[PDB]
Nucleic acid binder design. Structure first.
Ligand SMILES: [Mg+2]
Ligand SMILES: [Mg+2]
Ligand SMILES: [Mg+2]
Ligand SMILES: [Mg+2]
Lengths: 209, 195, 208, 196
DNA sequence: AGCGCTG
DNA sequence: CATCCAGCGCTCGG
DNA sequence: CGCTGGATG
DNA sequence: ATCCAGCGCTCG
């Protein structure tokens, strides 16, 4: 069972990463993800935030925009609020939690990096049982960057495309249903990708210059 | 009820009930399994320090609420220094098995200020929750610029002649050669067909 | 056998990293290293460069400065020149001969898998010189303090964090203790000892 | 020899020997085990495509050179598409077992332009090699002390005025700290240095 | 912004 | 036939 | 933008 | 028991 970790997590998550490998026996790869912490399945991303980050009202609007970005690419979003390493609550903190609950963003609480890794593993198990887990094992590097350029798809979706389509042409000539199954995305999401690849470019929709 | 909270008798004059005074009104009532009701369909199951130290007696009630139709439970739990060790096991059960919301609190004082927010959130319309409520041309330029050989200048020329990614992908070397050089045509063709 | 990888290597080295784990059975940790690719031991750092990076003369002086930085912290520097993924210049040959003349070892690799193989071989040699990395959360402030010490590597700072029970114990250590516990040379322990005993003088700084 | 290369007879009129003409002078000679000598103490062992396909016949000669005192070998090897499979095994042997320098070349043409550089590098003084040829610690020490929690830009210099080394700072009592920074930041500093 | 490649 | 710039893609570092 | 210590009640 | 001013800290 596989999990992708954002590279930025090495500046604060080293015990999360190494527990996941060592204690839990997941395949753990540290990846250049753009805008997320833990991709746990094809459907589920997990954001890791310290109490302090959640308390700090400077971070509120930026967090909500982060969650909004993640909503366009993932069906299941989890926030793990991890205790700071060696806490007074604010209205803004309670307000954020209630906001998240009202939008069905799941919240978990962790007292250390080891416990964060434990929750990540449990979340990994649930998703595996919904047959949406990450399936991966590379002279297909140009192709990956192309697929990542497709709007509102996650790194794992782009990876699936790279792995599953023998060529880019084969991807671009696929049906909506094929994109759904091979890229492991929802109907709606396969629809967005299909419309994009069939979209009739018009130079006159851009400024003249 | 309107602007109100239906409450279990057992919270009569508790620190929780005291700090909600003036902020929000409490209709007490007997025979209730859950601790509070925010609306008719959202309830609270307060699990105390005592509840969590003892064992898994708290769970019985949680199961009832989840397995009720026409009702949703928010579990609020007293996460102290004493209880912190038991909280993982509870959270696994509450959040991951049963699928219910769990909110830790250090004390009843905190649960006061938290429950006021839940009620302010319930009363709010779902639009003003920001997590509930474009031309592709620019993106397509950038996608096509990922093709080796193709930069700023060649990207728009290609999308003028082959107006979709699909048509671009199906273009012959001959069709490509008319728009870009023999060399950049090979690069594009190679890119789309390399197995 | 442990090896530390700079976090930047995930943008180009994913097969190097995963081979090292999977094929070679090293403990591989991706780390926030500042200015190096692979720390293979307490004495040896390995820089990984594509042929293109080596050919590109825009990169020559920048590479030389990078090797100079690394010389202040490591006794053994290796460059692995890795063939680019799917044409030779004087400045390329000039760089190679420069590196040879300063005893910087050069290895050549045709793919990321072969780079991982060389990194593993290099790991083995160093293990046999008893300078290998030995490592396994409340010590985080201490690490950032030790990393602030000039001209020491990430692994030297980690050793300090792991070996000294407290920072005070570190700062009261002998030169010899620093040598052994931080796993640095005499010269390097001397530089750390002088730093910790250096008499700060505010009048050596400008005023405003 | 000065401005010169002593060469093995076998390279008479080869593409290598041809491309070096005018650039550099070749004294040929018989009975030499190594291919060229740049100076008296640095030699070259050219391993050809033929050498590398056959097996490990090349190694005999390499062992002799490394095990010679008063002599160092640079191994230049023909890395073609044909040979590339054998190159890892050679490089492990040459670089990691024997400790010798190894430089791949596509062809003799490349080895020409490479050997000219080695000779230009040998002739060069070791100072003008930038990887061969002291500071106030005050700025660093400010930054080190700023890693102590509670201590920023302003408190760092005040502490180093009273406790002028990291060691003295590390040994300072809470009492001594209280005079400079006040009770809370004193505890933080003391805690930092002594937490086991 | 400078550098190598293509018509 | 062999070149010479000029435009472009690319990389790099602000 | 919160916390600490200190001047003002 | 209380405003605020200076500082450390985080973030852009
Ligand atoms: Mg229910
Ligand atoms: Mg391109
Ligand atoms: Mg010798
Ligand atoms: Mg500080």
């Amino acid at each position: 069972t596989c999990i992708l970790v954002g590279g930025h997590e090495i500046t604060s998550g080293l015990e999360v990463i190494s527990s996941l490998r060592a204690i839990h026996g997941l395949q753990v790869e540290v990846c250049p993800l753009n805008g997320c912490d833990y991709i746990v399945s094809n459907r589920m991303v997990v954001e890791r935030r310290s109490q302090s980050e959640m308390l700090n009202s400077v971070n509120k609007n930026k967090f909500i925009e982060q969650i909004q970005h993640l909503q366009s690419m993932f069906e299941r979003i989890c926030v793990i609020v991890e205790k700071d390493r060696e806490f007074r609550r604010t209205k803004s903190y309670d307000s954020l939690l209630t906001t998240l609950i009202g939008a069905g963003i799941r919240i978990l609480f962790s007292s250390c990096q080891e416990e964060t890794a434990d929750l990540l593993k449990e979340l990994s198990l649930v998703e595996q049982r919904k047959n949406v887990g990450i399936h991966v094992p590379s002279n297909k590097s140009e192709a990956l960057q192309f697929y990542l350029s497709i709007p509102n798809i996650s790194y794992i979706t782009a990876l699936n495309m790279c792995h599953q389509f023998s060529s880019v042409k084969r991807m671009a000539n696929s049906s909506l249903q094929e994109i759904s199954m091979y890229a492991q995305v929802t109907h709606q999401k396969a629809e967005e990708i299909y419309r994009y690849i069939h979209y009739v470019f018009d130079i006159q929709m851009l400024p003249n210059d | 009820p309107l602007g109100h909270i239906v409450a279990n008798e057992k919270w009569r004059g508790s620190q929780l009930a005291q700090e909600m005074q003036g902020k929000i009104k409490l209709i007490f009532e007997d025979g209730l399994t859950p601790d509070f009701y925010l609306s008719n369909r959202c309830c609270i199951l307060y699990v105390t320090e005592a509840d969590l130290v003892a064992g898994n007696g708290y769970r019985k009630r949680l199961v009832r609420v989840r397995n009720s139709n026409n009702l949703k439970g928010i579990v609020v739990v007293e996460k102290t220094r004493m209880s912190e060790q038991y909280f993982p096991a509870l959270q696994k059960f509450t959040v991951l098995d049963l699928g219910m919301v769990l909110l830790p609190v250090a004390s009843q004082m905190e649960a006061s200020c938290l429950v006021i927010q839940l009620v302010q959130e319930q009363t709010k319309e779902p639009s003003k929750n920001p997590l509930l409520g474009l031309l592709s041309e620019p993106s397509l330029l950038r996608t096509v610029q990922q093709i080796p050989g193709v930069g700023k200048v060649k990207a728009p020329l290609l999308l003028q002649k082959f107006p979709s990614i699909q048509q671009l992908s199906n273009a012959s070397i001959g069709e490509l050669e008319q728009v870009v050089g023999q060399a950049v045509a090979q690069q594009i063709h190679a890119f789309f067909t390399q197995p």
